[PDB]
């Protein structure tokens, strides 16, 4: 709570309105304090483009479309056009033409919503067409936590399967997990924890063989992999080029470089998609429908995804991807050169680093002391760096490597040293889930406290 | 109808080279100039709740300053976590939070719909854990928002919709009758969307308390109006946490809170309830993961606009806004009551449903649409409604509406069997089987996405 003292805290509405200019000044002051962390390349993921002129551009797109609410297509035809075209361009980028032009979908609020919508869809589709009333889904253990959300929300039994030695989904184990109640299998392209791409072709073939859905979670890789493959990097087919792939999610607000608050969910055919829609026919409020979870939604954010995609084009994404992968090659080589560290699996740009010899959490803390905001992993203990355009700026990778060497040097000198956040990650990794659940609940409570 | 199909290029694939930013902005601004008059000049029911150029410019700057904010990372954007904490606190206090003894808590969400879904899932999970209910039911009046049906289908909750009385308010006897040992929550609207009437919340909250079940007040529409109307001397009974039996309340900052689209609040009477809403993943290789609501990544900038809006208005601003709206409503209702063959459904304060026993109300609406009015068509019974906003408090807007309505009714009385434009569409939709409706709308949604 860095501002508790510096700025007044508001627990009750002001009696009189506060001047706009004063409110703006406080926000701007917080911005001056918070922006250098991501601007200067210290943050893993978080901000994916980060360029000043790009930001200004999307900020103006927002201003022009700020009142847009796509619940009302009659008032804002502009925003419906934007959403339709974001979906179309994304579908094409992800091999939709290979499906024969049946690929379709919707804009969503984020990767999580895309995943939730897909799971709900397979659930409803299977109930209607396969008579399945006790649905199951099989995904690798590395698959995004959002799958657990969907499981709990929608009453789907989630079966998570082990990884192989390269941290990729074990497809034999996935096959063993399939039952007559399974409605979907999923693979990540790539997964968040370690940035590796699952064996999508085998998973999709498994799905097709069992007559079940196959979802590819490309929320992280959707706007990178198509271009990496074009640049000559080893990426397995992972999209609608594969006959068994029935849906793909992709985050425009990540490497699509749109503003926070948008993603896309694509289905191979309209008859899948149709199970996603919500339609209310007998409501006295009149006919009501929505394609996704929301009713009212910020159409301005859809505008920013559209504007970003158009301002970049193929050349722009190809260029961005090249810069990121080149920075990634550099960083990966530098980590492998540090004696006591290793990279998990064979990632292209989301790099999980671990150590069998040292406390990786203290290494992480030593990096934190130098300004780095990295993600702490467990199972196994590691930290990762999701490289973005911010990390392609001059000197950033060299800074990371120099800092990482010192970090490793300090931990090697004091192997028992465990300071700051390191004991917290260490504890969370050993604690019983129920205990973590309770502690984290308290934590979320603190974030919402006003004094 | 897609207006820009023969005016602007359509994009079905990424452009090969990025298009110039200036050109992209030029096209969006062109659409803005064509679209803004409708809501600016007071022709739209609801849709835009504040609409003033200085307020909007103000919020547009708030967005710009916070545009990169993603509340998923409180460590990078402590500002945004502070904004959400305070929006919750201020809203809670405004809604009788102090009356519960300081235990009221909650979260910021993406909209009223998400608030309703969260509340419903929460009662589902709470009732399973504490009352062992595994086949949960919810009892709500037939007028309750379509989102309740959404929550029911999503979360496997049997929804029971109960009849209204003569004043279009919930029949509480019918609600009592519909309660079973599997009922986990009852709800009331404050007010409901179709007819703008406030349900008997005190009676409903009492019904709930007697049965040890939850009571949700859907104040998405009235949350930022009712508390102020009560203070202005208007007939509004307690509808919030002042009532012992009320356990949760939803309120839309993006409606009469005058925040930007994309935010709402869900409030619970006690933390033990709120805790059933959190999602926590403890075993995911991607590390500890939690989210208070449905989303993972979120557009923090929108939370900033809600906070900024509330602070810039304060009690005096909301009091003045409400006065202007109710004043306009009073004038408009008197005008409608003066027009022969029209009636108002129930006794609404500012969301006015008008119907006709003698004339086709749908053609009257079409006649208004021909004068530029964008109104909402209802059925059960056939009617239209106009949700008055600040846009309608501008000089002359109410007078224009009434003059137009007088003309529309005259035209329809002169040609009772005339039905043009959308009138036969609404008429068919009111008579059509729900399953048929669902199929036709599914095509309609497909149409919005055609490129």
């Amino acid at each position: 709570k860095p501002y508790r003292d510096r700025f007044p805290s508001h627990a009750r509405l002001p009696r009189a309105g506060l001047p706009r200019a004063e409110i703006l000044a406080e926000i701007a002051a917080m911005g001056a304090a918070e922006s250098p962390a991501w601007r200067d390349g210290y943050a893993s993921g978080a901000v994916y483009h980060g360029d000043e002129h790009h930001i200004a551009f999307l900020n103006e797109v927002y201003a022009l479309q700020s009142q847009s609410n796509p619940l009302h297509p009659d008032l804002w035809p502009s925003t419906a056009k934007f959403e339709a075209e974001v979906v179309a361009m994304t579908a094409h980028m992800l091999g939709g033409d290979a499906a024969g032009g049946t690929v379709c979908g919707t804009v969503t609020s984020g990767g999580t919503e895309s995943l939730l919508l897909a799971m709900k869809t397979y659930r409803d589709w299977a109930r209607a067409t396969k008579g399945i009333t006790a649905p199951e889904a099989v995904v690798p253990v590395s698959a995004h936590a959002a799958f657990d959300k969907a499981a709990q929300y929608f009453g789907i039994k989630l079966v998570r399967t082990p990884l192989d030695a390269d941290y990729r989904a074990d497809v034999a184990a996935m096959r063993e997990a399939i039952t007559p109640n399974t409605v979907v299998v999923a693979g990540s392209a790539p997964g968040y924890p370690h940035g590796v791409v699952d064996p999508i072709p085998e998973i999709a073939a498994l799905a097709a063989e069992h007559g079940i859905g196959c979802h590819v979670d490309a929320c992280l890789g959707g706007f990178i992999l198509p271009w990496a493959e074009r640049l000559g990097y080893p990426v397995p087919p992972f999209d609608f080029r594969l006959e068994g792939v029935t849906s793909v999610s992709a985050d425009t607000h990540k490497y699509g470089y749109g503003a926070k608050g948008t993603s896309v969910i694509l289905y191979r055919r309209p008859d899948l998609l149709h199970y996603q829609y919500f339609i209310a026919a007998d409501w006295p409020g009149g006919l009501y429908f929505s394609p996704t979870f929301a009713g009212s939604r910020p159409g301005a954010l859809s505008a920013t995804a559209w504007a970003a995609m158009l301002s970049l084009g193929e050349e722009g994404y190809l260029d961005a991807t090249r810069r990121i992968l080149q920075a990634a090659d550099r960083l990966k080589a530098g980590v492998r050169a540090i004696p006591s560290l290793k990279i998990l699996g064979d990632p292209l740009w989301v790099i999980a680093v671990a150590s069998d010899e040292l406390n990786i959490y203290q290494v992480m803390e030593e990096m934190a002391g130098r300004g780095w905001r990295l993600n702490g992993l467990h199972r196994p203990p590691a930290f990762h760096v999701a490289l973005t355009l911010r990390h392609t700026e001059p000197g950033v990778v060299d800074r990371f490597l120099a800092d990482l060497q010192d970090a490793v040097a300090q931990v090697r000198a004091h192997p028992e040293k465990a300071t700051g956040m390191a004991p917290v990650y260490g504890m969370a990794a050993a604690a019983p889930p129920e205990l973590v659940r309770q502690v984290l609940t308290g934590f979320i409570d603190l974030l919402y406290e006003v004094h």
Side-chain angles (χ1 to χ4, degrees), chain A residues 132 134-138 156-159 177-185:
Chain A
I132 293 170
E136 312 185 356
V138 178
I156 299 159
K157 166 200 250 209
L158 187 62
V159 178
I178 296 180
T179 78
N181 284 340
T182 307
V183 309
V184 69
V185 290

Side-chain angles (χ1 to χ4, degrees), chain A residues 21 78 113 122 138 160 184 222 321 355 366 387 406 442 446:
Chain A
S78 56
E113 170 166 28
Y122 288 111
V138 178
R160 289 187 175 272
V184 69
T321 303
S355 180
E366 296 293 326
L387 295 169
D406 293 347
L446 282 337

Side-chain angles (χ1 to χ4, degrees), chain A residues 390-433:
Chain A
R390 288 293 92 199
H391 305 119
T392 71
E393 292 297 310
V396 173
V397 163
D398 287 324
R399 187 179 73 214
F400 178 88
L401 290 179
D403 286 353
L404 218 216
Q405 298 158 5
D406 293 347
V408 163
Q410 166 76 188
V411 170
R412 191 182 302 279
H414 311 108
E416 199 80 36
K417 187 188 177 181
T419 67
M421 217 51 197
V424 170
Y425 286 107
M427 287 193 290

Side-chain angles (χ1 to χ4, degrees), chain A residues 202-218:
Chain A
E202 15 275 299
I203 302 171
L206 218 210
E209 162 189 1
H210 290 83
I212 69 179
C214 172
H215 182 76
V216 174
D217 177 7

Side-chain angles (χ1 to χ4, degrees), chain A residues 277-302:
Chain A
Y277 300 158
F278 171 76
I279 294 146
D282 297 311
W283 185 47
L287 287 206
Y288 189 89
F289 69 89
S290 61
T292 69
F293 285 141
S296 292
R297 43 207 194 265
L301 300 183
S302 296

